Symmetry: C3
Subunit: 360 residues, 3 copies
């Protein structure tokens, strides 16, 4: 039996509850979200700086797919499943500059940076060798809002159709997105469903108790969480200890988050690549405009690494454990207040209302 | 198809065999035993001393359930599923002294030590906020025989209904139970079905060959294993005569009162899955500060005695999956019911068999 | 629906493709290969040198079965499931010289080295104790080509029926096989289907790119892969500044007689599940006291040669689960059947295919 949700699930944030627990734990729900959501949506994978020059490539894994994204010699950005068409060896590893051809490690077939088979060894002596159908298998990729998105659906349109208006507002909050460079990346296999991790991001109800260092840097009467078109913006004014330093927190469907902290001069990005119902690989990327980091930046990197990020990781991990309990009645009340203050949870209701549309 | 046993399974200990091997390995058998037995029986979790003072609390995990047991400000012992009613964060960790209210770490809802929602931050501004229906979810707990039992079955009666006479007999074996204090705990995730570990305890057929260091005290002809009602007693006199008690109680807690009757060890089996059982091996002394002779005995249990029994049940769990294991094992019951008779296994499995009709 | 193949699957190596990817990943396909192939075929486990003397024994694990192969008092080689018939404890571990009877470590039942029950403690006072049928459970074992093969099918015939002509030809490749002794064993749990590891051994298409240090001996001009009857031979001439043999035998044991013909390496594959295969990589020399050249070569295999092949099969296992991998891979057979032809794969897979009708 398949679990289904109503169309109006969390349609009313003022009186709303989180998903029945099975949606956070069921492997069958995950397998449905994997193909209905993560194989048919634009999945953000990197900032443009990782792929800015010809021959630049990166590799990612999401929902079990090892994918390579590569800027071809023609400067055309492409993405491919990272698997040789001869006998399935992976083609590239890590990140870097590709040679002028991709040489598979197992039998040294070569491919052009557009996936075309360049040379199959001993090809000429193999009967009825299919040169056309021995090329790398592509998927869609789009450079959007200064970042890179992939899509496994061959019939997808463009990122703007998925996140209407998002590219312009993000560039409004940070005017140096195009000069950012990856300063630090935190990689964690998190034992929480991807939806639990989004829930946590979508509210600051927990900042008082769970985030001491991120609690004075934020005004509760000067904090607004507005929903948009498959994304939301959490905006507020800071004063930890520019007559009004602002901060931005974007959530975009399905689960990528873009943060522009006070100053608007750098970004952190949360990438969620789901693994299974109770596992989500996370990239926590910190981006600065300078390549050689000052020590105030290196300290900031370690503060997120060792103090700030561990707090949210424990939260989502404990929640994943708790909601399997028979002592958890099943659903959790979303603490929306009618003024949408800085500790209102209504943003969770907006996210989950979108998720619910995939469970009819 | 679900496995089942004749209700007369091991009804005759003189001619009996262990479960067909699938009962030790099948996930569908385990999931049935998990709910039919471990979610509906009294599960011993601690000695009372761990919960003797107001605000004292402990946490246990059993059959996938994180449970908190907590002595309220009002001195009333209660138990709760260890999960906040708002959005599922765990409430307490480890063991110790709870504050006067429980503060959930995620959104800082407050709960009185009886589970009551005290204050949910900003509730007053949340439409249609439910007062209780947002309280901690409790489960039954009872102090019995000086120990603490929990029960996830809301319609369970009392521990005495489950173990008729056990409190009476254990208090005759050790008269200082309430003065006991936890001296040491061995936590082991053991890769054996919980029933393999009970099988192991229910017989001394193996003590000669498998426990060399535990042979210089026991007497083979002054050893008796008598069955009662959902518990059994292994009773004997030890080489000088000091007596000793080995209680097994349904489903899988064992209480040992070694010679001297002044201390106890207790085996708690918290099953995890068909082939995994969390074990607490607790040693309890009446004194707070351990002597160095007590630390040595603790060490012997930890490094010599317990490894022998853990190795046996781990090896058996592997071996009974072999296609070369014909399926069932003969229970070595003798007419005399000697110090090495295995008939106690038949009593244990006959009760288990009643849950597989 | 269960996955099936045409009988002519890879019957024509000139126009052939590897299995549809489900055959390398499906646990149902594995369970069928497990029982149709690995429980009914002769499985090579060791060289004779390990079991040459009375009471010598080894232990192996393959397809979930812990097996002991033991040379009886009477110099008769036997194989048994390594599980006591009483209550399932394992009987022996590792390799070594067994004592005149096997004494189980749980209840000290004794067995003779031919599997018969010697003495079951207290049996005399146990009602209806079955002495015949309280035996170690045997399985078939055969010494062939200087090696030892087991078979879980008690109606199995002999290894020659499985590998017709193999011993004859192997003894021509290495004339001192009976003089070999185990110098080194690399045990690796490999996350690849057993068939992926065979596919890899069956071709030298990959030696140029994947084995740089192994490239001066791999000459396409002087390298032949001929198929026979459930085994194949990759024979070539090496370049110094001498011939070499590489036998694959059904289902998955590979015997290498490298240049010089004075030593052997052997690849034993013991599949675990669809995506896990335990491998033994055995290096055999005739002398017991290794020289530094031999000690250096063992480490070259351990740190240089074998890691390259292990990475190849591990990446392939990952890659063929990709939705970007079209079902099957083209087997690169060339008309000449050169040293880089992949036709050996088609021979192997056509045989496998016979078990998937
Ligand atoms: C170092 O960057 C990060 C990265 C992640 C976050 C972050 C962490 N945890 C929970 C959260 C909930 C909500 C939000 C949000 O609504 N977004 C912005 C608010 C936080 N902000 C401060 C300055 N700029 C943004 N962020 C959260 C903050 C800072
Ligand atoms: C001290 O804690 C343990 C913990 C585990 C055991 C234990 C382990 N395995 C099998 C067993 C069979 C029978 C019995 C028994 O008769 N138990 C009663 C007191 C035995 N006693 C004598 C001297 N010291 C202790 N115990 C067994 C004993 C003792
Ligand atoms: C020395 O032991 C090993 C052990 C493993 C191999 C080996 C490993 N991987 C792929 C392979 C493909 C083909 C062949 C072959 O052609 N095998 C025949 C013996 C050729 N020879 C070379 C050096 N010495 C002997 N071997 C492969 C070779 C040698
Ligand atoms: S896998 Fe054979 S060439 Fe890439
Ligand atoms: S989860 Fe306990 S307060 Fe929100
Ligand atoms: S288990 Fe081997 S003798 Fe009892
Ligand atoms: Fe947070
Ligand atoms: Fe014991
Ligand atoms: Fe190789």
């Amino acid at each position: 039996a398949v679990e289904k949700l109503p169309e109006d699930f969390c349609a009313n944030p003022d009186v709303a509850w989180t998903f029945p627990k099975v949606f956070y734990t069921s492997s069958q729900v995950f397998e449905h979200e994997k193909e209905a959501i993560f194989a048919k949506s634009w999945i953000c994978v990197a900032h443009g700086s990782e792929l800015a020059q010809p021959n630049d490539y990166i590799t990612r894994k999401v929902i079990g797919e090892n994918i390579v994204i590569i800027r071809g010699k023609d400067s055309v950005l492409r993405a491919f499943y990272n698997v040789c068409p001869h006998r399935g060896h992976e083609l590239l590893s890590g990140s870097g500059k590709a040679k002028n051809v991709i040489t598979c490690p197992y039998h040294a077939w070569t491919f052009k940076l557009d996936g075309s088979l360049a040379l199959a060894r001993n090809c000429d002596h193999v009967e009825s060798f299919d040169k056309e159908n021995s090329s790398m298998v592509p998927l869609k990729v789009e450079e959007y809002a200064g970042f890179v998105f992939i899509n496994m659906d061959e019939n997808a349109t463009c990122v703007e159709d998925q996140l209407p208006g998002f590219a312009e507002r993000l560039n409004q909050a940070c005017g140096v997105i195009k000069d950012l460079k990856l300063a630090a990346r935190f990689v964690t296999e998190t034992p929480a469903n991807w939806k639990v991790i989004v829930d946590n991001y979508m509210e600051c109800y927990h900042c008082g108790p769970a985030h001491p260092g991120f609690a004075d840097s934020v005004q509760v009467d000067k904090y607004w969480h507005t929903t948009h078109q498959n994304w939301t913006l959490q905006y507020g004014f800071a004063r930890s200890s520019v007559t009004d330093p602002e901060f931005h927190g974007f959530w975009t469907w399905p689960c990528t988050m873009f943060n522009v902290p006070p100053g608007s001069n750098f970004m952190t990005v949360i990438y969620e690549f789901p693994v299974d119902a109770e596992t989500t690989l996370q990239h926590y990327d910190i981006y600065f405009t300078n390549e050689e980091l000052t020590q105030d930046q290196k300290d900031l990197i370690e503060w997120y690494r060792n103090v700030f990020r561990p707090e949210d990781l424990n939260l989502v991990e404990s929640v994943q454990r708790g909601l399997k309990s028979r002592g958890y009645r099943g659903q959790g009340r979303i603490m929306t207040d009618k003024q949408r203050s800085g500790i209102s949870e209504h943003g969770i209701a907006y996210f989950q209302h979108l998720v619910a549309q995939y469970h009819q």
